[PDB]
Design a protein around this nucleic acid. Structure first.
Length: 580
DNA sequence: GACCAACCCT
DNA sequence: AGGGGGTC
Protein backbone atom coordinates (compact mmCIF):
# COMPACT_ATOMS: atom_id res chain seq x y z
CA UNK A 1 0.00 0.00 0.00
CA UNK A 2 2.66 2.54 -1.17
CA UNK A 3 2.61 6.04 0.46
CA UNK A 4 2.71 8.88 -2.00
CA UNK A 5 5.95 10.88 -2.31
CA UNK A 6 8.24 12.69 -4.70
CA UNK A 7 11.50 10.94 -5.35
CA UNK A 8 13.29 14.19 -6.07
CA UNK A 9 16.41 14.60 -8.27
CA UNK A 10 16.96 18.21 -7.30
CA UNK A 11 16.22 20.28 -4.19
CA UNK A 12 13.35 22.75 -4.67
CA UNK A 13 12.02 25.66 -2.56
CA UNK A 14 8.90 23.80 -1.39
CA UNK A 15 11.24 21.34 0.39
CA UNK A 16 12.53 24.25 2.51
CA UNK A 17 9.42 25.20 4.45
CA UNK A 18 9.96 26.63 7.89
CA UNK A 19 8.37 23.62 9.59
CA UNK A 20 9.14 20.06 8.59
CA UNK A 21 9.70 16.51 9.69
CA UNK A 22 13.15 15.50 8.65
CA UNK A 23 14.89 12.16 8.43
CA UNK A 24 18.64 12.00 7.89
CA UNK A 25 19.24 8.29 7.96
CA UNK A 26 22.47 6.87 9.33
CA UNK A 27 22.18 3.14 9.40
CA UNK A 28 25.55 2.24 10.98
CA UNK A 29 25.07 1.83 14.76
CA UNK A 30 28.15 3.91 15.44
CA UNK A 31 27.35 7.11 13.64
CA UNK A 32 30.81 8.78 13.85
CA UNK A 33 32.11 9.50 10.30
CA UNK A 34 29.39 7.18 8.97
CA UNK A 35 27.42 7.37 5.74
CA UNK A 36 24.11 9.14 5.42
CA UNK A 37 22.12 6.76 3.18
CA UNK A 38 19.08 8.94 2.44
CA UNK A 39 17.03 11.94 3.38
CA UNK A 40 13.31 12.51 3.63
CA UNK A 41 11.31 15.62 4.28
CA UNK A 42 7.62 15.93 5.00
CA UNK A 43 6.02 19.32 5.25
CA UNK A 44 2.78 21.24 4.34
CA UNK A 45 3.63 20.91 0.61
CA UNK A 46 4.13 17.16 0.58
CA UNK A 47 6.53 14.30 1.09
CA UNK A 48 10.00 14.11 -0.48
CA UNK A 49 12.96 11.71 -0.67
CA UNK A 50 16.35 13.14 -1.55
CA UNK A 51 19.58 11.36 -2.28
CA UNK A 52 22.28 12.60 0.14
CA UNK A 53 24.89 13.31 -2.55
CA UNK A 54 22.42 15.68 -4.21
CA UNK A 55 20.96 17.36 -1.13
CA UNK A 56 24.16 17.75 0.88
CA UNK A 57 25.96 19.35 -2.09
CA UNK A 58 23.04 21.79 -2.56
CA UNK A 59 23.87 25.12 -0.89
CA UNK A 60 20.24 26.06 -0.25
CA UNK A 61 19.51 22.69 1.46
CA UNK A 62 22.65 22.98 3.59
CA UNK A 63 21.60 26.57 4.50
CA UNK A 64 18.12 25.32 5.43
CA UNK A 65 19.62 22.62 7.68
CA UNK A 66 21.66 25.31 9.44
CA UNK A 67 18.84 27.86 9.82
CA UNK A 68 17.62 27.99 13.39
CA UNK A 69 14.32 29.59 12.34
CA UNK A 70 13.55 26.60 10.04
CA UNK A 71 12.06 24.13 12.53
CA UNK A 72 12.54 20.41 12.23
CA UNK A 73 10.94 17.42 13.89
CA UNK A 74 13.13 14.35 14.02
CA UNK A 75 13.82 11.06 15.70
CA UNK A 76 17.31 10.82 17.30
CA UNK A 77 18.50 14.13 16.09
CA UNK A 78 21.95 13.67 17.72
CA UNK A 79 22.71 10.80 15.34
CA UNK A 80 21.93 13.04 12.42
CA UNK A 81 23.66 16.08 13.92
CA UNK A 82 26.83 14.13 14.61
CA UNK A 83 26.92 12.44 11.14
CA UNK A 84 26.50 15.85 9.55
CA UNK A 85 29.25 17.37 11.73
CA UNK A 86 31.77 14.89 10.34
CA UNK A 87 30.77 16.22 6.87
CA UNK A 88 31.25 19.86 7.92
CA UNK A 89 27.50 20.62 8.02
CA UNK A 90 25.49 22.18 10.87
CA UNK A 91 22.04 21.01 11.85
CA UNK A 92 20.01 23.61 13.69
CA UNK A 93 16.43 24.34 14.59
CA UNK A 94 15.41 20.88 15.83
CA UNK A 95 12.37 21.85 17.92
CA UNK A 96 11.07 18.29 18.50
CA UNK A 97 12.82 15.00 19.02
CA UNK A 98 10.42 12.05 19.05
CA UNK A 99 13.02 9.68 20.56
CA UNK A 100 13.46 11.97 23.55
CA UNK A 101 9.70 12.65 23.76
CA UNK A 102 8.94 8.91 23.91
CA UNK A 103 11.71 8.32 26.47
CA UNK A 104 10.30 10.96 28.84
CA UNK A 105 6.76 9.57 28.53
CA UNK A 106 7.77 6.02 29.36
CA UNK A 107 11.41 4.86 29.59
CA UNK A 108 10.29 1.25 30.11
CA UNK A 109 9.01 0.94 26.51
CA UNK A 110 12.63 0.80 25.23
CA UNK A 111 11.69 2.98 22.25
CA UNK A 112 14.62 2.79 19.85
CA UNK A 113 12.92 3.37 16.56
CA UNK A 114 10.11 5.46 15.09
CA UNK A 115 7.84 2.39 14.81
CA UNK A 116 8.02 1.73 18.58
CA UNK A 117 7.24 5.39 19.37
CA UNK A 118 4.39 5.34 16.85
CA UNK A 119 2.84 2.24 18.49
CA UNK A 120 2.40 4.22 21.72
CA UNK A 121 -0.26 6.23 19.88
CA UNK A 122 -1.81 3.40 17.81
CA UNK A 123 0.05 4.59 14.72
CA UNK A 124 1.26 1.60 12.79
CA UNK A 125 1.77 2.83 9.20
CA UNK A 126 5.57 2.53 9.49
CA UNK A 127 7.91 -0.47 9.72
CA UNK A 128 10.43 -1.27 12.48
CA UNK A 129 13.95 -0.49 11.33
CA UNK A 130 14.89 -4.10 12.10
CA UNK A 131 12.40 -5.33 9.49
CA UNK A 132 13.72 -2.90 6.86
CA UNK A 133 17.47 -3.32 7.50
CA UNK A 134 17.39 -6.90 8.85
CA UNK A 135 19.73 -7.84 11.73
CA UNK A 136 23.22 -9.08 12.53
CA UNK A 137 25.24 -10.40 9.57
CA UNK A 138 22.22 -9.86 7.26
CA UNK A 139 22.02 -6.16 8.10
CA UNK A 140 21.88 -4.32 4.74
CA UNK A 141 20.62 -1.05 3.28
CA UNK A 142 17.91 -2.11 0.84
CA UNK A 143 17.37 -0.84 -2.67
CA UNK A 144 16.21 2.69 -3.24
CA UNK A 145 12.45 2.23 -3.61
CA UNK A 146 12.23 0.18 -0.41
CA UNK A 147 14.66 2.60 1.38
CA UNK A 148 12.81 5.72 0.18
CA UNK A 149 9.40 4.46 1.19
CA UNK A 150 10.67 3.59 4.69
CA UNK A 151 12.30 6.99 5.28
CA UNK A 152 9.18 8.85 4.04
CA UNK A 153 6.95 6.71 6.32
CA UNK A 154 9.21 7.60 9.26
CA UNK A 155 9.04 11.31 8.43
CA UNK A 156 5.30 11.09 7.96
CA UNK A 157 4.98 9.35 11.36
CA UNK A 158 7.03 12.12 13.01
CA UNK A 159 4.87 14.75 11.35
CA UNK A 160 1.70 12.97 12.59
CA UNK A 161 2.93 12.20 16.12
CA UNK A 162 4.42 15.53 17.25
CA UNK A 163 1.09 16.99 18.42
CA UNK A 164 -0.03 13.89 20.39
CA UNK A 165 3.36 13.46 22.15
CA UNK A 166 3.56 17.17 23.10
CA UNK A 167 -0.07 17.06 24.42
CA UNK A 168 0.75 14.12 26.66
CA UNK A 169 4.06 15.66 27.75
CA UNK A 170 2.14 18.81 28.76
CA UNK A 171 -0.46 16.87 30.74
CA UNK A 172 2.43 15.18 32.55
CA UNK A 173 4.18 18.58 33.14
CA UNK A 174 7.12 17.27 31.08
CA UNK A 175 6.98 19.76 28.17
CA UNK A 176 9.65 22.00 29.64
CA UNK A 177 11.69 18.95 30.53
CA UNK A 178 11.76 18.03 26.84
CA UNK A 179 12.22 21.51 25.37
CA UNK A 180 14.45 23.19 27.98
CA UNK A 181 16.50 20.21 29.18
CA UNK A 182 16.73 17.03 27.09
CA UNK A 183 16.72 18.69 23.63
CA UNK A 184 19.38 21.34 24.40
CA UNK A 185 21.39 18.62 26.24
CA UNK A 186 21.26 16.52 23.08
CA UNK A 187 23.14 19.19 21.12
CA UNK A 188 25.72 19.52 24.00
CA UNK A 189 26.22 15.79 23.89
CA UNK A 190 26.68 15.95 20.12
CA UNK A 191 29.52 18.51 20.54
CA UNK A 192 31.13 16.32 23.25
CA UNK A 193 31.01 13.15 21.17
CA UNK A 194 32.29 14.96 18.09
CA UNK A 195 35.24 16.62 19.92
CA UNK A 196 36.18 13.27 21.47
CA UNK A 197 38.97 12.53 23.98
CA UNK A 198 42.59 12.29 22.96
CA UNK A 199 44.41 9.06 23.81
CA UNK A 200 48.14 8.49 24.29
CA UNK A 201 48.19 5.23 22.39
CA UNK A 202 51.95 4.74 22.90
CA UNK A 203 51.48 4.79 26.64
CA UNK A 204 48.64 2.29 26.33
CA UNK A 205 50.72 -0.01 24.10
CA UNK A 206 53.54 -0.09 26.62
CA UNK A 207 51.08 -0.73 29.46
CA UNK A 208 49.80 -3.62 27.33
CA UNK A 209 53.35 -4.99 27.01
CA UNK A 210 53.98 -4.96 30.74
CA UNK A 211 50.60 -6.59 31.50
CA UNK A 212 51.34 -9.17 28.81
CA UNK A 213 54.43 -10.10 30.80
CA UNK A 214 52.86 -10.11 34.26
CA UNK A 215 50.05 -12.22 32.84
CA UNK A 216 52.53 -14.83 31.54
CA UNK A 217 54.14 -14.96 35.00
CA UNK A 218 50.85 -15.39 36.92
CA UNK A 219 49.54 -17.87 34.32
CA UNK A 220 52.61 -20.12 34.76
CA UNK A 221 52.38 -19.85 38.55
CA UNK A 222 48.76 -21.01 38.30
CA UNK A 223 49.69 -24.09 36.22
CA UNK A 224 52.59 -24.76 38.61
CA UNK A 225 50.19 -24.53 41.59
CA UNK A 226 47.44 -26.55 39.91
CA UNK A 227 50.01 -29.15 38.81
CA UNK A 228 48.72 -28.95 35.24
CA UNK A 229 47.97 -26.61 32.33
CA UNK A 230 44.33 -25.70 31.65
CA UNK A 231 42.10 -22.92 30.36
CA UNK A 232 41.95 -20.64 33.38
CA UNK A 233 39.09 -18.77 31.66
CA UNK A 234 36.99 -21.97 31.19
CA UNK A 235 34.43 -22.29 34.02
CA UNK A 236 34.40 -26.06 33.43
CA UNK A 237 38.15 -26.58 33.66
CA UNK A 238 38.61 -24.07 36.52
CA UNK A 239 35.75 -25.61 38.50
CA UNK A 240 37.36 -29.02 38.09
CA UNK A 241 40.79 -27.73 39.29
CA UNK A 242 39.47 -25.81 42.26
CA UNK A 243 36.58 -27.89 43.51
CA UNK A 244 37.62 -31.41 42.44
CA UNK A 245 41.39 -31.75 41.95
CA UNK A 246 42.06 -29.36 44.84
CA UNK A 247 38.94 -30.07 46.97
CA UNK A 248 38.23 -26.46 47.81
CA UNK A 249 34.84 -26.11 49.57
CA UNK A 250 31.83 -25.37 47.43
CA UNK A 251 30.34 -22.22 48.93
CA UNK A 252 28.16 -21.19 45.96
CA UNK A 253 26.69 -23.02 43.04
CA UNK A 254 25.89 -21.50 39.67
CA UNK A 255 22.86 -22.43 37.62
CA UNK A 256 25.22 -24.46 35.41
CA UNK A 257 28.06 -25.42 37.83
CA UNK A 258 30.44 -24.17 40.52
CA UNK A 259 30.68 -20.45 41.19
CA UNK A 260 34.11 -18.74 40.99
CA UNK A 261 33.09 -15.09 41.54
CA UNK A 262 35.63 -12.86 43.29
CA UNK A 263 33.58 -12.87 46.53
CA UNK A 264 33.72 -16.67 46.63
CA UNK A 265 37.43 -16.81 45.76
CA UNK A 266 38.33 -14.36 48.55
CA UNK A 267 36.80 -16.80 51.05
CA UNK A 268 38.76 -19.74 49.57
CA UNK A 269 42.11 -17.91 49.62
CA UNK A 270 43.32 -19.30 53.00
CA UNK A 271 42.96 -22.88 51.76
CA UNK A 272 45.27 -22.69 48.76
CA UNK A 273 47.82 -20.35 47.12
CA UNK A 274 46.26 -20.94 43.67
CA UNK A 275 43.35 -18.68 44.64
CA UNK A 276 45.16 -15.31 45.07
CA UNK A 277 46.94 -15.97 41.74
CA UNK A 278 43.65 -16.64 39.98
CA UNK A 279 42.26 -13.39 41.36
CA UNK A 280 45.34 -11.35 40.29
CA UNK A 281 45.18 -13.08 36.92
CA UNK A 282 41.57 -11.95 36.42
CA UNK A 283 42.31 -8.36 37.48
CA UNK A 284 45.15 -8.10 34.91
CA UNK A 285 43.22 -9.92 32.22
CA UNK A 286 40.30 -7.55 32.64
CA UNK A 287 42.62 -4.56 32.28
CA UNK A 288 44.31 -6.13 29.26
CA UNK A 289 41.25 -7.22 27.32
CA UNK A 290 38.67 -4.55 28.12
CA UNK A 291 40.85 -1.52 28.77
CA UNK A 292 44.14 -1.82 26.85
CA UNK A 293 42.94 -3.87 23.85
CA UNK A 294 39.36 -2.63 23.78
CA UNK A 295 40.38 0.99 23.89
CA UNK A 296 43.08 0.51 21.26
CA UNK A 297 40.48 -1.11 18.93
CA UNK A 298 38.20 1.95 19.08
CA UNK A 299 40.77 4.79 18.86
CA UNK A 300 40.63 6.51 15.50
CA UNK A 301 44.08 6.21 13.92
CA UNK A 302 43.85 9.52 12.15
CA UNK A 303 43.26 11.58 15.25
CA UNK A 304 44.18 9.35 18.10
CA UNK A 305 40.84 10.16 19.71
CA UNK A 306 38.02 7.98 21.01
CA UNK A 307 34.53 9.27 20.26
CA UNK A 308 31.97 7.75 22.61
CA UNK A 309 28.26 7.67 21.98
CA UNK A 310 26.12 8.84 24.90
CA UNK A 311 22.76 7.13 24.92
CA UNK A 312 20.42 9.74 26.31
CA UNK A 313 17.25 7.56 25.85
CA UNK A 314 18.14 4.28 27.55
CA UNK A 315 18.35 4.23 31.36
CA UNK A 316 15.20 3.82 33.48
CA UNK A 317 16.34 6.63 35.82
CA UNK A 318 17.32 9.58 33.54
CA UNK A 319 21.03 8.86 33.53
CA UNK A 320 23.09 8.77 30.40
CA UNK A 321 25.05 5.77 29.32
CA UNK A 322 28.20 5.52 27.20
CA UNK A 323 29.35 3.03 24.58
CA UNK A 324 32.20 2.23 22.21
CA UNK A 325 33.99 2.96 24.25
CA UNK A 326 32.23 3.26 27.59
CA UNK A 327 34.06 6.13 29.22
CA UNK A 328 31.97 5.95 32.39
CA UNK A 329 33.66 2.79 33.65
CA UNK A 330 37.36 3.55 33.37
CA UNK A 331 39.12 1.88 36.35
CA UNK A 332 39.76 4.01 39.42
CA UNK A 333 39.38 1.99 42.66
CA UNK A 334 42.63 -0.05 42.48
CA UNK A 335 45.82 1.86 41.68
CA UNK A 336 47.06 -0.61 39.05
CA UNK A 337 43.89 -0.06 37.00
CA UNK A 338 43.61 3.68 37.69
CA UNK A 339 46.84 4.19 35.74
CA UNK A 340 44.86 3.52 32.60
CA UNK A 341 43.73 7.11 33.05
CA UNK A 342 47.25 8.34 32.30
CA UNK A 343 46.42 7.49 28.66
CA UNK A 344 43.64 10.11 28.47
CA UNK A 345 45.25 13.41 27.63
CA UNK A 346 44.32 16.90 26.49
CA UNK A 347 43.74 17.28 22.72
CA UNK A 348 46.13 20.24 22.38
CA UNK A 349 49.55 21.23 23.67
CA UNK A 350 49.53 23.35 26.82
CA UNK A 351 45.99 22.25 27.60
CA UNK A 352 44.97 20.50 30.78
CA UNK A 353 42.22 18.11 31.93
CA UNK A 354 39.83 19.57 34.52
CA UNK A 355 37.44 17.29 36.52
CA UNK A 356 34.67 18.51 38.80
CA UNK A 357 32.39 16.22 40.87
CA UNK A 358 29.48 16.54 43.23
CA UNK A 359 30.17 15.44 46.76
CA UNK A 360 27.42 12.98 47.91
CA UNK A 361 24.79 14.35 45.58
CA UNK A 362 22.46 11.31 46.10
CA UNK A 363 22.48 11.66 49.90
CA UNK A 364 22.03 15.39 49.65
CA UNK A 365 19.01 14.93 47.34
CA UNK A 366 17.62 12.44 49.84
CA UNK A 367 18.07 14.97 52.60
CA UNK A 368 16.16 17.48 50.50
CA UNK A 369 13.28 15.26 49.35
CA UNK A 370 12.78 13.50 52.73
CA UNK A 371 13.33 16.73 54.70
CA UNK A 372 15.08 14.75 57.41
CA UNK A 373 16.29 17.19 60.07
CA UNK A 374 19.27 15.16 61.15
CA UNK A 375 20.47 14.51 57.62
CA UNK A 376 19.91 18.13 56.47
CA UNK A 377 21.82 19.38 59.53
CA UNK A 378 24.65 16.98 58.75
CA UNK A 379 25.00 18.44 55.24
CA UNK A 380 24.54 22.03 56.36
CA UNK A 381 27.52 21.46 58.65
CA UNK A 382 29.34 19.83 55.72
CA UNK A 383 30.12 16.75 57.86
CA UNK A 384 31.72 13.54 56.74
CA UNK A 385 28.40 11.76 56.23
CA UNK A 386 29.66 8.27 56.81
CA UNK A 387 31.36 9.14 60.12
CA UNK A 388 28.24 10.95 61.24
CA UNK A 389 26.02 7.97 60.28
CA UNK A 390 28.44 5.71 62.25
CA UNK A 391 28.16 8.01 65.27
CA UNK A 392 24.38 7.92 65.19
CA UNK A 393 23.73 4.25 64.54
CA UNK A 394 26.37 3.12 67.06
CA UNK A 395 25.59 5.90 69.57
CA UNK A 396 29.26 6.93 69.91
CA UNK A 397 31.30 10.13 69.73
CA UNK A 398 33.49 10.94 66.75
CA UNK A 399 36.63 9.72 68.64
CA UNK A 400 35.05 6.32 69.06
CA UNK A 401 34.28 5.63 65.36
CA UNK A 402 36.66 2.84 64.33
CA UNK A 403 37.55 2.25 60.64
CA UNK A 404 35.29 -0.84 60.59
CA UNK A 405 32.37 1.18 62.03
CA UNK A 406 32.76 3.77 59.30
CA UNK A 407 32.97 1.12 56.57
CA UNK A 408 29.73 -0.41 57.80
CA UNK A 409 27.83 2.91 58.15
CA UNK A 410 28.98 3.65 54.63
CA UNK A 411 27.47 0.38 53.34
CA UNK A 412 24.26 1.21 55.14
CA UNK A 413 24.19 4.63 53.43
CA UNK A 414 24.49 2.98 50.02
CA UNK A 415 21.85 0.56 51.13
CA UNK A 416 19.37 3.22 52.17
CA UNK A 417 19.93 4.92 48.80
CA UNK A 418 19.35 1.73 46.75
CA UNK A 419 16.36 0.97 48.98
CA UNK A 420 17.87 -2.33 50.08
CA UNK A 421 16.56 -4.81 52.62
CA UNK A 422 17.88 -6.68 55.64
CA UNK A 423 18.79 -9.48 53.19
CA UNK A 424 20.74 -7.31 50.67
CA UNK A 425 22.70 -5.40 53.32
CA UNK A 426 23.61 -8.77 54.97
CA UNK A 427 25.27 -9.96 51.78
CA UNK A 428 27.14 -6.73 51.30
CA UNK A 429 28.51 -6.60 54.86
CA UNK A 430 28.97 -10.36 55.16
CA UNK A 431 26.63 -10.56 58.21
CA UNK A 432 23.40 -12.17 59.47
CA UNK A 433 19.96 -11.04 58.31
CA UNK A 434 18.87 -10.13 61.88
CA UNK A 435 22.03 -8.04 62.23
CA UNK A 436 21.32 -6.12 59.01
CA UNK A 437 17.71 -5.51 60.13
CA UNK A 438 19.12 -4.09 63.37
CA UNK A 439 21.30 -1.61 61.42
CA UNK A 440 18.43 -0.44 59.28
CA UNK A 441 16.27 -0.10 62.41
CA UNK A 442 18.95 2.06 64.09
CA UNK A 443 19.41 4.10 60.90
CA UNK A 444 15.69 4.90 60.75
CA UNK A 445 15.70 5.74 64.50
CA UNK A 446 18.34 8.35 63.73
CA UNK A 447 16.82 9.50 60.41
CA UNK A 448 13.08 9.27 60.95
CA UNK A 449 12.46 11.60 57.99
CA UNK A 450 14.16 9.12 55.68
CA UNK A 451 11.94 6.34 57.01
CA UNK A 452 8.88 8.51 56.52
CA UNK A 453 10.03 9.20 52.94
CA UNK A 454 10.58 5.52 52.13
CA UNK A 455 7.07 4.67 53.38
CA UNK A 456 5.47 7.64 51.69
CA UNK A 457 7.07 7.10 48.32
CA UNK A 458 6.07 3.43 48.13
CA UNK A 459 2.47 4.41 48.82
CA UNK A 460 2.65 7.20 46.27
CA UNK A 461 3.97 4.76 43.68
CA UNK A 462 1.02 2.45 44.43
CA UNK A 463 -1.53 5.29 44.38
CA UNK A 464 -0.34 7.08 41.21
CA UNK A 465 1.28 4.22 39.31
CA UNK A 466 4.64 5.99 39.10
CA UNK A 467 7.25 8.08 40.91
CA UNK A 468 8.82 11.31 39.77
CA UNK A 469 12.01 13.30 40.02
CA UNK A 470 12.74 16.92 40.91
CA UNK A 471 12.41 18.02 37.32
CA UNK A 472 9.30 15.83 36.60
CA UNK A 473 10.94 12.81 35.03
CA UNK A 474 8.72 9.75 35.52
CA UNK A 475 9.07 6.02 36.10
CA UNK A 476 6.06 3.65 35.99
CA UNK A 477 6.18 0.87 38.56
CA UNK A 478 3.37 -1.59 37.79
CA UNK A 479 5.08 -4.37 39.82
CA UNK A 480 4.42 -2.36 42.94
CA UNK A 481 1.04 -4.18 43.32
CA UNK A 482 2.35 -7.66 42.55
CA UNK A 483 1.41 -10.44 44.96
CA UNK A 484 4.84 -11.99 44.49
CA UNK A 485 7.16 -10.81 47.29
CA UNK A 486 10.43 -10.63 45.27
CA UNK A 487 8.86 -8.83 42.27
CA UNK A 488 6.97 -6.45 44.57
CA UNK A 489 9.99 -5.79 46.77
CA UNK A 490 12.18 -4.86 43.75
CA UNK A 491 9.51 -2.40 42.58
CA UNK A 492 9.48 -0.89 46.07
CA UNK A 493 13.29 -0.41 45.98
CA UNK A 494 12.89 1.32 42.62
CA UNK A 495 10.20 3.57 44.12
CA UNK A 496 12.63 4.54 46.84
CA UNK A 497 15.80 4.94 44.71
CA UNK A 498 14.43 6.42 41.45
CA UNK A 499 13.60 9.96 42.72
CA UNK A 500 17.12 10.07 44.25
CA UNK A 501 19.18 8.72 41.32
CA UNK A 502 16.88 10.40 38.79
CA UNK A 503 16.84 13.79 40.52
CA UNK A 504 20.65 13.63 40.70
CA UNK A 505 20.67 12.97 36.95
CA UNK A 506 18.29 15.90 36.42
CA UNK A 507 20.64 18.25 38.37
CA UNK A 508 23.81 17.32 36.55
CA UNK A 509 22.04 17.67 33.14
CA UNK A 510 20.92 21.13 34.07
CA UNK A 511 24.51 21.96 35.18
CA UNK A 512 25.80 20.84 31.78
CA UNK A 513 23.34 23.19 30.07
CA UNK A 514 24.13 26.07 32.39
CA UNK A 515 27.85 25.48 31.98
CA UNK A 516 27.80 25.41 28.19
CA UNK A 517 25.98 28.78 28.24
CA UNK A 518 28.53 30.25 30.70
CA UNK A 519 31.56 29.02 28.81
CA UNK A 520 30.19 30.73 25.72
CA UNK A 521 29.30 33.96 27.45
CA UNK A 522 32.89 34.10 28.83
CA UNK A 523 34.33 33.17 25.44
CA UNK A 524 36.44 30.43 27.04
CA UNK A 525 37.95 27.76 24.78
CA UNK A 526 37.38 25.17 27.55
CA UNK A 527 35.26 22.23 26.44
CA UNK A 528 33.13 19.54 27.94
CA UNK A 529 34.46 16.14 27.05
CA UNK A 530 32.66 13.74 29.41
CA UNK A 531 29.94 13.22 31.97
CA UNK A 532 30.21 10.40 34.49
CA UNK A 533 26.90 10.51 36.40
CA UNK A 534 28.02 13.01 39.07
CA UNK A 535 31.02 14.49 37.44
CA UNK A 536 32.04 16.63 34.50
CA UNK A 537 35.38 16.34 32.74
CA UNK A 538 36.70 19.19 30.58
CA UNK A 539 39.88 20.16 28.74
CA UNK A 540 41.16 23.70 28.46
CA UNK A 541 44.26 25.86 27.99
CA UNK A 542 46.45 26.09 31.07
CA UNK A 543 45.66 29.81 31.04
CA UNK A 544 41.99 29.10 31.77
CA UNK A 545 42.46 26.81 34.77
CA UNK A 546 42.13 29.56 37.42
CA UNK A 547 38.91 30.80 35.95
CA UNK A 548 37.51 27.23 35.62
CA UNK A 549 38.30 26.66 39.31
CA UNK A 550 35.80 29.33 40.16
CA UNK A 551 33.36 28.98 37.33
CA UNK A 552 32.72 25.23 37.02
CA UNK A 553 31.91 24.41 40.70
CA UNK A 554 29.73 27.50 41.04
CA UNK A 555 27.62 26.59 37.98
CA UNK A 556 27.29 23.00 39.18
CA UNK A 557 26.36 24.11 42.70
CA UNK A 558 23.83 26.66 41.58
CA UNK A 559 22.12 24.39 39.04
CA UNK A 560 19.18 23.97 41.47
CA UNK A 561 18.52 25.25 44.99
CA UNK A 562 17.85 22.43 47.47
CA UNK A 563 17.19 22.62 51.22
CA UNK A 564 20.86 21.73 51.71
CA UNK A 565 23.88 23.12 49.83
CA UNK A 566 25.40 21.31 46.91
CA UNK A 567 29.13 20.80 47.06
CA UNK A 568 31.51 20.32 44.15
CA UNK A 569 35.17 19.31 44.34
CA UNK A 570 37.59 19.80 41.47
CA UNK A 571 41.07 18.99 40.31
CA UNK A 572 43.10 19.37 37.16
CA UNK A 573 46.32 18.06 35.72
CA UNK A 574 48.22 16.84 32.66
CA UNK A 575 46.18 13.66 32.26
CA UNK A 576 42.79 12.40 33.55
CA UNK A 577 44.76 10.40 36.13
CA UNK A 578 46.40 13.57 37.47
CA UNK A 579 43.06 15.35 37.65
CA UNK A 580 42.59 14.05 41.14
C1' DG B 1 23.69 -15.53 17.46
C1' DA B 2 22.22 -15.60 22.18
C1' DC B 3 23.03 -16.35 26.96
C1' DC B 4 25.25 -16.17 31.20
C1' DA B 5 28.74 -15.49 34.86
C1' DA B 6 31.84 -12.35 35.60
C1' DC B 7 33.63 -7.57 36.63
C1' DC B 8 34.47 -2.51 35.60
C1' DC B 9 32.01 2.26 36.90
C1' DT B 10 28.63 5.78 39.82
C1' DA C 1 19.95 1.33 42.50
C1' DG C 2 21.60 2.22 37.32
C1' DG C 3 24.80 0.93 33.29
C1' DG C 4 28.55 -1.63 29.49
C1' DG C 5 34.92 -14.95 26.79
C1' DG C 6 33.19 -19.59 26.83
C1' DT C 7 29.48 -22.38 26.06
C1' DC C 8 25.69 -24.36 23.91
Amino acid sequence: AKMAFTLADRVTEEMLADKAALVVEVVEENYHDAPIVGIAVVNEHGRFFLRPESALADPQFVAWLGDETKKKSMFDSKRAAVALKWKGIELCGVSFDLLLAAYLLDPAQGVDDVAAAAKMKQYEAVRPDEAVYGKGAKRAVPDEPVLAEHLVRKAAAIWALERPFLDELRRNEQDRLLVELEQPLSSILAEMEFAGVKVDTKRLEQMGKELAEQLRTVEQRIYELAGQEFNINSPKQLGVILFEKLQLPVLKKTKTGYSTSADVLEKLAPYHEIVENILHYRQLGKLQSTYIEGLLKVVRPDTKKVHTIFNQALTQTGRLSSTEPNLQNIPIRLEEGRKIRQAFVPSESDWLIFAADYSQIELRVLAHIAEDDNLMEAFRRDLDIHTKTAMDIFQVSEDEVTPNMRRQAKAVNKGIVYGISDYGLAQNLNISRKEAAEFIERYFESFPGVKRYMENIVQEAKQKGYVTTLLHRRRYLPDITSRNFNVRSFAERMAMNTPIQGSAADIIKKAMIDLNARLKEERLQARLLLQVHDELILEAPKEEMERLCRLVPEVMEQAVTLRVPLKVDYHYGSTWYDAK
